[PDB]
Every structure is written in C-alpha cells, then in structure tokens.
Amino acid sequence: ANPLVYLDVDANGKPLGRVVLELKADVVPKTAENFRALCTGEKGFGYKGSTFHRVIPSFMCQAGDFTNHNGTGGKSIYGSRFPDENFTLKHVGPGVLSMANAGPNTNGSQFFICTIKTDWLDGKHVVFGHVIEGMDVVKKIESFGSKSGRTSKKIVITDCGQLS
Ligand SMILES: NCCOCCNC(=O)[C@@H]1CCNC(=O)/C=C/C(=O)N2CCC[C@](Cc3ccccc3)(C2)C(=O)N[C@@H](Cc2ccco2)C(=O)NCc2ccccc2CC(=O)N1
C-alpha cells in the first residue's frame, strides 16, 4: 500500500498542526521512497528541523532544502540528485505534492505542496503524492508567505516521519 507520511509544522515555535501525505509509490516508486526516507531520517539526514523557505500565496509552499535553507540545496537518498522518474501525475489542484527542481533531472530533496492547480508545471515537475489530512495546516503555512516567497515567520518542520 502507498506509504503515509507526516509533517508537524510550527511557525516561530508555535505548532500549526499535522499534514499527512499519501505517497504514490504505485506510480512513482523511486520518488516516493526518497521522500519517505527523508521524512523518517533513516539515512541520517532529512526534513526534520528544516524550513518552508519559499511560500507564495495562491501558488505553493516549498520546503526540503535542509542543506542551504534557501532553495539552492538539498540532497536525495540516491546521491546528490536523481532523474525525473515520470510525469504521469498532474498538478491538478490544492494538496498536490511535487518535486522542486532547477530544470530537468535535478531532483534532490526540495518539494512543494500546491495550493492551486499549477498546470504549467505539468511535464516539468514530478508529482508524487497528495495531502490527505491537514490542508488547513497548509493554508496556515501559505498565510505566512508573500508574492516574492519570503515568509513572515520561520516555518519549520518540527517533526516528520512515516505512519505505519
Ligand atoms: N499565477 C499564479 C501562480 O503563479 C506563480 C508563478 N510563478 C512560477 O510559476 C515560477 C516562475 C519561475 N520562477 C522560478 O523558477 C523561481 C526560482 C527561484 O525561486 N529560485 C530561488 C532558489 C534557487 C533557484 C536557482 C538555483 C540556484 C542554485 C541551484 C539551483 C537553482 C531560483 C531555483 O530555481 N531553485 C529551485 C529549487 C531547487 C534547486 C534544486 C532542487 O530544487 C526552485 O526554486 N525552482 C522553482 C520552483 C520550485 C517549486 C515549484 C515550482 C517552481 C517553479 C517556479 O517557481 N515557477
């Protein structure tokens, strides 16, 4: 069955609640496994303690740069980067979980959660899951963003892992 993972998120130390994500291992197993392992921290690194560094209302909330905290860094469990697995799943609406990148075949650890349908990213970013619980928490994160993406509070993934 598809893995379920969680992000517990805070803003300036105040808990916002839990986001639960279903990872579509049935369609993108390699991309799902990378995210799952970065949630559990089992390789010795991952999302715990890192930030949503770029949050743009009516677009998406971006996170996963646990090395540089600014959209330039991150690393996968497969080495630094890994290729785009497929573009089967589309950016259909709020709650889509997809890989951030810097062009083709540059996936590492950065990811985003959409707050709208972002169809112009179809075929360019690998979609690999969806929010199943806690979209209200995603909307709280979104509320601390701005047009440039700079956040007005430090938004931290306080804890994360797999629900089994
Ligand atoms: N109309 C309503 C809504 O409208 C909104 C319209 N805006 C949209 O569509 C916008 C329009 C186009 N601007 C952008 O590409 C924004 C770029 C941006 O912020 N950099 C800041 C961080 C560094 C940069 C450049 C750099 C430097 C060093 C190393 C690698 C790269 C640039 C980057 O590129 N780092 C990746 C992250 C990443 C690196 C490695 C793995 O991951 C990044 O952030 N990629 C951008 C991105 C991330 C997640 C989802 C989508 C998108 C596309 C997007 O943001 N597209």
Numbering used by the authors: 3 to 166
Which statements did the authors publish about this structure?
Cyclophilin D (CypD) is unique as a mitochondrial cyclophilin and a key regulator of the mitochondrial permeability transition pore (mPTP), a transient channel on the inner mitochondrial membrane that opens under oxidative stress or high mitochondrial matrix calcium levels. Adjacent to the active site is the S2 pocket, a distinct exo-site that forms part of a long substrate-binding groove for peptides.
JOMBt and A26 show promiscuous cyclophilin inhibition, similar to that of CsA. The benzyl group of A26 engages in hydrophobic contacts with T115, while the macrocycle backbone forms a closer hydrogen bond with the side-chain N–H on W163.
